């Protein structure tokens, strides 16, 4: 749970290859293979979601998720 | 020429890091004090810093006297002894030596034939896996002329030019240890002693109930899907009773991990109260 703390680095999931390994094309520019950790969902990742990585390893850590009409029939 | 422990005094180390880290990104260099022994325990006592022009990749000692004006200023207290070696720092790059390091190290050894270099890498040196290492150069002259005794212990499998170059000219790489005594470990751990107030502070409740009838809400949804997850489970194979259900949030554990927890932190909240009651 320690490394899951700061200072992380962002990325962008692309696709899996195994029960415990996926890939990323981060914002830094390049593409890296990387292993997800357990204690973590899987159901919520396959698209180009948003993610968070561990800097030096370039590992993976945890997930992160996120006009006004005013009228009425009277 | 093996089995050479290198004990270090804990007063020495943390000074090596602090000045070894405060100068980051630009690297940094100081000295070691200690004393050789017959062959094995080349201990260390205390360190200090020569002034210097530090870069991210290079540095020298500017002044050639602040190390000499200070030993002569130390023996008035005599809190240490003579010199035994010198360290330096590679801030994010790994632990090894370079062609500059040897040229200066090659002076110390011929000056005194057991002196030692030390290398440190504070950036990747996390609260766990420190990576410090030390080195004694060889005589490649003695090599082309062409040692273990019943124990060797530890070798590295990384730091490439400490792993394929780390022998042919670098050094008879050599382990380290720590002289953590009782007289100091007592004064060492005196941080984490919380306080004599720090075991009867019945903190506010306005999160407690907001956790209690919040937690049970988080129990059911994993329970009643574990209620689903026992439907028959004898389906199409013994492995099909296992591998059709990946470990994506295995439910029964997940409730037990909180079952015990909410029990374990509430039982203290109730007990602590009745004890605090008899403060009066």
B248 touches chain A (CB under 8 A): yes
* Cβ atoms B116, B136 nearer than 8 A: yes
* Cβ atoms B131, B124 nearer than 8 A: yes
How many whole angstroms separate alpha carbon B192 and alpha carbon B188? Answer: 9
How many whole angstroms separate alpha carbon B172 and alpha carbon B133? Answer: 12
Cα B179 to Cα B7, B71, B115, B183, distances in angstroms: 6, 24, 20, 11
> In angstroms, how far is CA B143 from the centroid of its own chain?
34
How many whole angstroms separate alpha carbon B32 and alpha carbon B20? Answer: 13
**What percent of the residues of chain A are helix, what percent strand, and what percent coil, each to the nearest 5?**
0, 30, 70
B257 touches chain A (CB under 8 A): no
How many whole angstroms separate alpha carbon B213 and alpha carbon B218? Answer: 9
How many CB atoms neighbour CB B159 within 10 A?
20
- Ranges of beta strands (E only) in B81-164 are 83-87, 116-119, 133-135
DSSP alpha helices (H): ranges in B47-153? 68-74, 99-111, 140-145
Query: Which positions ≥6 away from B199 have C-beta within 8 Å?
Result: none
Residue A41 is nearest to which of B124, B127, B248, comparing CB atoms?
A: B248
| Chain B environment of A42 (Cβ under 8 Å) | 246, 248
A–B interface: beta-carbon pairs under 8 A? 9
* Cβ atoms A14, A50 nearer than 8 A: no
Please tell me the experimental approach by which this structure was elucidated: cryo-EM
**Which of B43, B115, B114, B33 lies closest to B80, judged by CA?**
B33
Cα A5 to Cα A12, A52, B27, B29, distances in angstroms: 19, 10, 27, 31
Say what angle helices B208-226 and B251-277 make with each other, to 10 degrees.
160
B214 by DSSP, 3-state: which?
Answer: helix
- Residues A38, B124: C-beta atoms closer than 8 Å: no
Instruction: List, edge to edge, every strand of the sheet that includes B83-87.
Output: B43-49, B30-35, B83-87, B116-119, B133-135
**Closest-CA distance of chain A to residue B191, Å:** 20
The resolution, in Å, is 4.2
How many whole angstroms separate alpha carbon A40 and alpha carbon A23? Answer: 16
Region of B136 on the Ramachandran plot (φ > 0 left; ψ -120 to 50 alpha; else beta): beta
């Amino acid at each position: 749970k320690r490394i899951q703390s700061v200072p992380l680095v962002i990325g962008q999931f692309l696709e899996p290859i195994d029960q415990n390994t996926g890939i990323v094309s981060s914002t830094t520019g390049m593409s890296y293979v990387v292993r997800i950790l357990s204690t973590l969902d899987r159901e919520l990742l396959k698209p180009s979601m948003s993610v968070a990585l561990h800097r030096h390893s370039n590992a993976l850590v945890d997930i992160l998720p996120p006009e006004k009409p005013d009228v009425t029939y009277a | 020429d093996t089995k050479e422990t290198v004990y270090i005094s804990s007063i020495a180390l943390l000074k090596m890091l602090k000045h070894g880290r405060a100068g980051v990104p630009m690297e940094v260099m100081g000295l070691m004090l200690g004393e050789f022994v017959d062959d094995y325990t080349v201990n260390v006592v205390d360190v200090f810093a020569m002034p210097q022009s530090g870069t991210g990749v290079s540095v020298e000692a500017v002044d050639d006297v602040f190390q000499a004006k200070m030993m002569d200023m130390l023996k008035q207290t005599g809190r240490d002894q003579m010199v035994v070696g010198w360290y330096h720092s590679h801030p994010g790059f790994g632990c090894w030596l370079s062609s500059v390091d040897v040229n200066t190290q090659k002076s110390f050894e011929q000056l005194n034939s057991r002196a030692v270099a030390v290398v440190v890498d504070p950036i990747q040196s996390v609260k766990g896996k420190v990576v410090i290492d030390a080195f004694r150069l060889i005589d490649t002259g003695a090599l082309i002329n062409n040692q273990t005794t019943s124990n060797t212990g530890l070798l590295n499998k990384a730091n490439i030019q400490a792993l394929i170059h780390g022998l042919n000219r670098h050094y008879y790489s050599l382990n380290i240890d720590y002289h953590k005594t009782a007289k100091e470990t007592k004064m060492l751990m005196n941080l984490h002693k919380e306080q004599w107030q720090s075991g009867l502070k019945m903190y506010d409740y306005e999160e407690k109930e907001e956790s209690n009838l919040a937690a049970t809400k988080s129990m059911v949804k994993i329970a009643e899907q574990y209620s689903k997850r026992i439907e028959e489970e004898k389906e199409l194979t013994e492995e099909e009773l296992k591998t059709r259900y990946v470990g994506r949030q295995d439910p029964k554990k997940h409730l037990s991990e909180t079952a015990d927890e909410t029990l374990e932190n509430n039982i203290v909240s109730v007990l602590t109260a009745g004890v605090n009651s008899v403060a009066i």
